[PDB]
Structure 1
Amino acid sequence: QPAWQIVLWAAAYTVIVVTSVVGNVVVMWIILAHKRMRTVTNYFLVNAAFAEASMAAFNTVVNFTYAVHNEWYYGLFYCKFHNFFPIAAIFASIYSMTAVAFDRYMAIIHPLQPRLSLTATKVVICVIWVLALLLAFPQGYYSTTETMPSRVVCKIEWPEHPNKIYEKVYHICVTVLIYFLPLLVIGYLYTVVGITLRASGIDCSFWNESYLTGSRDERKKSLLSKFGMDEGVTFMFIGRFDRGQKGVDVLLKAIEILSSKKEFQEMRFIIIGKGDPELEGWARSLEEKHGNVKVITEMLSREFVRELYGSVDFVIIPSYFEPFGLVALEAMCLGAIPIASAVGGLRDIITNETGILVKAGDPGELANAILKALELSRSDLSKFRENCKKRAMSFSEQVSAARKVVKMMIVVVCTFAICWLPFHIFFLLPYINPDLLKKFIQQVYLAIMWLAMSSTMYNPIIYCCLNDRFRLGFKHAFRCCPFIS
């Protein structure tokens, strides 16, 4: 191999070393030196930054030179460290990222359950390092320098056994512990969290009362006149007509219960949806029997639905099953006060001060909640509507912020997975097809090892790109340079 290629490879590995050391040291300064940054998540990130900066500072140069010149000149202790540290460092790093993913999963999926205190996170960090050092110990213990037979090499001398079963089992278990298992765990955690956050998202640039015109009373009166009705307290339902799911059968039973009451004269109902023909026929018979009931089975534009949310008094959401409840957020953003089953995301979003909640599947409690809404309508409802809108906005703000942090950690984990896949494939291939034929293998090995080692420099760059606080910290760290002011 020509020397100019060696100089280029040496420059590339040097870029890894300097980028990883500078970026991870600045990350540790950004977290440790600023009291607002001292959180559970940032403590695990500091631990990962320490492990990655250490592996880059203390392994990369000799890994390169030994790959290029296959004689070991660096002593016995460094031979042990060379085979010991990378395993412990990658273990500590990836399990710190796994702890971060678990902390986010707990905060979003089980908010009531206690999470780690800061001292508990320091204990977990020490435990992670103890397990990492114990896992890496055998490689350190069996490493030795020896002529093979005439020139010195650093080699792991495993106890001779049944066709090297001990090294094979150890290599497989390490590859599982530092790659496949943590990736599967983090992938489960962030799949559940990312789906939950995206399904709890709403477009506030559309579902927004600012795009309606006039007073709410003029809008409601114009809407009821468009449906041919006299003014009254207006309840709206929108959803599929089915049994055991979206609850239109519960609402129809509740309307039948209310129809004998005198208060029924003051109510108006708009039932929007399609589905089970029996439920459609039941709704149409209620629509013909009663002049204060209207049914819409045709599909509606989201603009017309936004107009409805901004005009009706209440939106009834009698779901048996509602994991995320974006429909509650749409109603509350437009000032419609929700009347909903206390299940799932509805129970999470709506509060006593921002809506009326009922037991799912109970037409009588839904009818009583509708009568309660009618009692409330005699008074001004402006404050109630303001509370609904404020709750929907603040819930949406938290969702977007969590989505940004989760997107950053997903980019972190995907980058780790990409950087280490070729490395583990290169070392697992002999078991599958033992033909590592040169075929430019040293160039392939230098490239694969460069990608693997470069994994240690990306996280500070990812933090600077995808997190405002880390970008501000990097600006503060590099203020001297003629860019930042």
Structure 2
Amino acid sequence: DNVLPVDSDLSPNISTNTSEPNQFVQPAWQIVLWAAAYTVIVVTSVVGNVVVMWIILAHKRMRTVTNYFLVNLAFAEASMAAFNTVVNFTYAVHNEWYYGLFYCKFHNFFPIAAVFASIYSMTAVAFDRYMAIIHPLQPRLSATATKVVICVIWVLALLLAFPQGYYSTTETMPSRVVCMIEWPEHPNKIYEKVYHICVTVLIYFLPLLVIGYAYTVVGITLWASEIPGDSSDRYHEQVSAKRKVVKMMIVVVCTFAICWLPFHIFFLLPYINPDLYLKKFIQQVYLAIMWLAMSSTMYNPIIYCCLNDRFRLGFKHAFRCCPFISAGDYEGLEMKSTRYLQTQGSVYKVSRLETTISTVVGA
């Protein structure tokens, strides 16, 4: 059933993804279809993620530790839109890996790093949520640490992403020109088999479990129920506000799992039964999921807008060059003081709370 590519070479038709078009694998139009999907994605992913990164940096008020983690996520998405999607697009219209083996490596490595980093960052977010809920004590926490933490996630991400570059597994996806870890063969010199189990479980699965677990602990504490006003089942507006953040974080995770999980499952199943067909082992299946994972890059900016008024209002401030932020503003801390932005609403040295300075702000 299999050749180096997913299709059988009953005919001599099969040709290397590096050398020629893969038109035999799927209809040519399907190639343009995937190319089309990528092109549109590039626009959305770039604009949305840039907006997120831009807005939080631009608006002084949105400086939360969580915001730091989100920039990290946004950054990971940006790399996808700039780095990975572009190559994936070129290939698609070419119908194969014009770039050749070196590039397959470059292209797989960066995209792999992006996926690993995302799930790992989501875990940090989960843990931080747990910490915020149980121990509101603000001082046990530092912005500086967050940067350190973010860097750490990247380091671990490299731990999986980089070793394939080290003599380890390698390869292109079903129709593909997307490159990923070598699930198909057990290229012995390469020691593929070991790498495969290790990577999925350690990088994707374990972090998924932790996020799930941390999620459960949060269940006892702040839950979905949150009354819009501070009053009612909320003990302080800040407490009531936080519940909003947690819910978005939950949705962010959910969307993440839905997008990626199918790929990871297919990752493993072919590992167990390579050279065979799953329900059907084909170009189409592997392809659909990996490209689907790419869509994730776009979803987070949408969730933010829908999910939180603060970003929504603050973003709008950014969109219209001037303030022009009608629509009711944040009606809370657009900024703590009032409106928030680089300028405009976010007044220098935003106000402080408590005789002492409760939040590390107004420093």
Counterpart CA distance in 1 for 2:225 and 2:30 is 81
Consecutive unaligned residues of structure 1, counting only runs of 5 or more, are 197-370, 387-397
Three-state SS of the structure 1 residue aligned to 2:169 is strand
CA contact (8 A) 1:55 1:89 kept: yes
Counterparts of 2:294 and 2:104, CA distance in 1? 18
What is the deviation of 1:424? 1.2
Shift of 1:374: 37
Per-residue displacement from partner, 1:35-59 (whole Å, max 9, x unpaired)? 1112211001001110111023211
User: Closer, same or farther in 2 for the Cα pair 1:442/1:153, shift >3 Å?
Assistant: closer
Which sits farther off after the overlay, 17-26 or 80-89?
80-89
Tell me the secondary structure at the aligned position of residue 377 of structure 1: coil
- Distance change (3 Å), C-alpha of 1:86 and 1:453: same
Alpha-carbon separation, structure 2, partners of 1:15 and 1:379: 41
2:163 & 2:92 partners in 1: Cα distance? 22
The structure-2 alpha-carbon separation of the partners of 1:383 and 1:166, relative to structure 1 and needing over 3 Å to count, comes to closer
Give the direction of change, closer, same or farther, for the CA distance of 1:110–1:164 in structure 2 (3 Å limit).
Answer: farther
Equivalent pairs counted in the alignment come to 299
Residues 91, 177 of structure 2: 8 Å contact kept: no
The question of 1:180 aligning with 2:205 is answered yes
| Distance in 1 separating the partners of 2:282 and 2:295 | 19
> Offset of 1:8 from its aligned partner?
2.6
Residues 144, 410 of structure 1: CA spacing in aligned structure 2 closer, same or farther, 3 A cutoff? closer
Q: CA deviation at 1:448?
A: 1.2
Post-superposition shift, 1:177? 3.3
Q: Could you tell me which of 445, 448, 468 is aligned with 2:286?
A: 445
* 2:252/2:300 contact within 8 Å kept: yes
Q: CA deviation at 1:373?
A: 36
Aligned-pair CA distance for 1:404: 1.4
1:123-176 deviation line (CA, Å, top 9, x unaligned): 111222122223211222348999999999989899998957832222222212
Change (3 A) 1:64 1:426: farther
Higher relative contact order (CA 8 A, sep 6+): 2
Sort the Cα spacing of 1:53 and 1:177 in 2 relative to 1 into closer, same or farther, 3 A: farther
The answer to which of 156-165 and 445-454 deviates more is: 156-165
Partners of 1:373 and 1:442 in 2: CA distance: 41
Aligned residue number for residue 120 of structure 2: 95
Aligned-pair CA distance for 1:384: 17
154 and 417 in structure 1: CA distance in 2 versus 1, 3 angstrom threshold: closer
Report the aligned-residue RMSD: 8.1
For residues 252-293 of structure 1, the C-alpha deviation after alignment (integer angstroms, 9 at most, x for no partner) is: xxxxxxxxxxxxxxxxxxxxxxxxxxxxxxxxxxxxxxxxxx
Q: If the length of structure 2 is used for normalisation, what is the TM-score? A: 0.66
Q: Per-residue CA shift, 1:200-240, capped at 9, x if unaligned?
A: xxxxxxxxxxxxxxxxxxxxxxxxxxxxxxxxxxxxxxxxx
Q: CA deviation at 1:420?
A: 0.6
1: CA distance between counterparts of 2:79 and 2:160? 18
Corresponding residue for residue 322 of structure 2: 481
SS of the residue corresponding to residue 37 of structure 1 reads coil
**Is the CA contact (8 Å cut-off) linking 2:77 and 2:114 kept in structure 1?**
yes
Partner-residue secondary structure (3-state), 1:84 = helix
> How far apart are residue 66 of structure 1 and its match?
4.3
C-alpha deviation, 1:104, in angstroms: 1.5
Compared with structure 1, are the counterparts of its residues 4 and 440 closer, same or farther at alpha carbon in structure 2 (3 Å cutoff)?
farther
| Cα shift readout 1:343-381 (whole Å, capped 9, x = no counterpart) | xxxxxxxxxxxxxxxxxxxxxxxxxxxx99999999999
CA deviations over 1:277-314 (Å, ceiling 9, x no partner): xxxxxxxxxxxxxxxxxxxxxxxxxxxxxxxxxxxxxx
Would you tell me which structure has more helix in proportion to its own residues? 1
Larger Rg: 1
Task: Give the SS at the match of 1:373.
Answer: coil
Residue 455 to residue 18, structure 1, CA distance change in 2 (3 Å): same
Q: Is contact 1:190-1:406 (8 Å) kept? A: no
**Per the alignment, in what secondary structure is the counterpart of residue 266 of structure 2?**
helix
Report the Cα distance in structure 2 between the residues aligned to 1:181 and 1:402, rounded to whole angstroms. 27
2:69–2:121 CA contact under 8 A, matched in 1: yes
Superposed CA offset, 1:38-88 (max 9, x none)? 221100100111011102321124335546766432256533221211222
Distance 1:143 1:184, change over 3 A: closer
Is the CA contact (8 Å cut-off) linking 2:38 and 2:88 kept in structure 1? no
Identical positions, percent: 94
Cα contact 1:27–1:46 (8 A) shared by 2:
yes
Compared with structure 1, are the counterparts of its residues 5 and 190 closer, same or farther at alpha carbon in structure 2 (3 Å cutoff)?
same
Deviates more, 1:135-144 or 1:376-385: 376-385
Match of 2:257 in 1: 417
Deviations 1:391-413 (A, max 9, x none): xxxxxxx4432221111000000
CA distance change for structure 1 residues 43 and 7 in 2, over 3 Å: closer, same or farther? same
Secondary structure in 2 matching 1:173: helix
Q: Which runs of 4+ in 1 moved over 6 A?
A: 143-162, 371-386, 480-483
Inter-partner Cα distance in structure 1 for 2:259 and 2:168: 26
**Structure 2 residue runs without a partner (length 5+):** 1-25, 325-362
CA shift, 1:435, in A, is 5.4
- Corresponding position of 2:166: 141
TM-score, scaled relative to structure 1: 0.51
